[PDB]
Subunit: 212 residues, 2 copies
């Protein structure tokens, strides 16, 4: 999952960027390389440690000016102040958050730490009902997950449950955003690659935080 | 899956090493780094391409003298001459070969391209019957694979069959080797990590090619 080019139409030179769910920091470091100041955020210290590791390795940059810092954070309770950031990126993050109420609380937090009229770049997987094998997985796991579009990712050799993944409907994603006072500025359905190599449909969205 | 230290008791300074099933070349490059001349072999050009890619990247070496070359090969029909190599490494390779007759033909080829009294370093996964989830997988897939210890690795999100994996019994591995005139010099049962992160028991073996 790379950064879609569209993001560069909305970024401005001195934007302070929050990367929510940075993992081991691929995207944060790519933005830093392009001259942006980015804070990469993640709940687990493992990922954050790896990210600061990667962040040392040199000669990466295609531009000057950027920097990347990483911090362990709980996205439904950010340490940062209101209006701390010019831009947020949320790439395949909410998909790993099993509680729909937890997801709104995260969006409210992003809204809070973003300045007025700041943009949010969001990429998520859609519910691929049209794909027989995904329809089957959704049908099979609903009785367990009890949420529509949430299913279990399983160990390939063993079939043991590893984690809960959620796929979104357009309606659901749109309202998650517009209920927290974002406006949709850019929206595409795209073919995305899952963390396991499947080609499925998802969404690329640029939302803008409304002025008070 | 790293190289077990034992290998360094059997390697000699100017050994020419064959790495069968080199993938993207992690192990070949590690041996090259340590000053060995190594040929990394793999059936698919993708892996080989990546390997020559990785092989360009610099500053890796902890010793001088080594080099790594990569070639697309079919292991049951090697292009190399008899007695071409002082040492062979076969790490989690045979596990991906679904035909037990194909596996003997590979061992015969390794025997052929190895010099008299050369060593073979082999690492493989054992049949973990003691692990309930592996016992269950073996039981479930036998009717499909029709080979004992062979099962299907499945897509984590979708459950679709990706590939056939084989786990070995000690008897089976021992005879695969001793039927082709190797003698077992070193043998350990170790806890290994699967390509998907499972901790299962397997084998580390140093076999020696018998003198004619
Ligand atoms: Ca499964
Ligand atoms: Ca796949
Ligand atoms: Ca696992």
């Amino acid at each position: 999952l790379d950064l879609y080019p569209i993001i560069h139409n909305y970024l401005q030179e001195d934007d302070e960027i929050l990367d929510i769910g940075c993992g081991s920091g691929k995207i944060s470091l790519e933005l830093a390389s392009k001259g942006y100041s980015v804070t990469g955020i993640d709940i687990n210290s493992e990922a954050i440690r790896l990210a600061e590791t990667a962040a040392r390795s040199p000669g990466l940059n295609q531009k000057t000016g950027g920097k990347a810092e990483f911090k362990v954070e709980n996205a439904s309770s950010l340490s940062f102040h209101d209006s701390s950031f010019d831009f947020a990126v949320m790439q395949a993050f909410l998909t790993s958050v099993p509680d729909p109420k937890e997801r709104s609380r995260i969006i409210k937090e992003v809204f809070r730490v973003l300045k007025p009229g700041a943009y949010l770049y969001l990429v998520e997987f859609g519910q691929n009902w049209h794909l027989k094998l995904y329809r089957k997985r959704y049908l099979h796991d609903f009785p367990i997950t009890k949420e529509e579009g949430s299913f279990l990712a399983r160990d390939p050799e063993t079939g043991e449950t590893e984690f809960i993944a959620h796929h979104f409907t357009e309606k659901e994603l749109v309202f998650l955003l517009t209920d927290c006072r974002f406006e949709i500025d850019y929206f595409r359905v795209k073919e995305l690659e899952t963390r396991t190599g499947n080609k499925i449909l998802g969404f690329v969205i640029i939302a803008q935080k409304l002025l008070e």
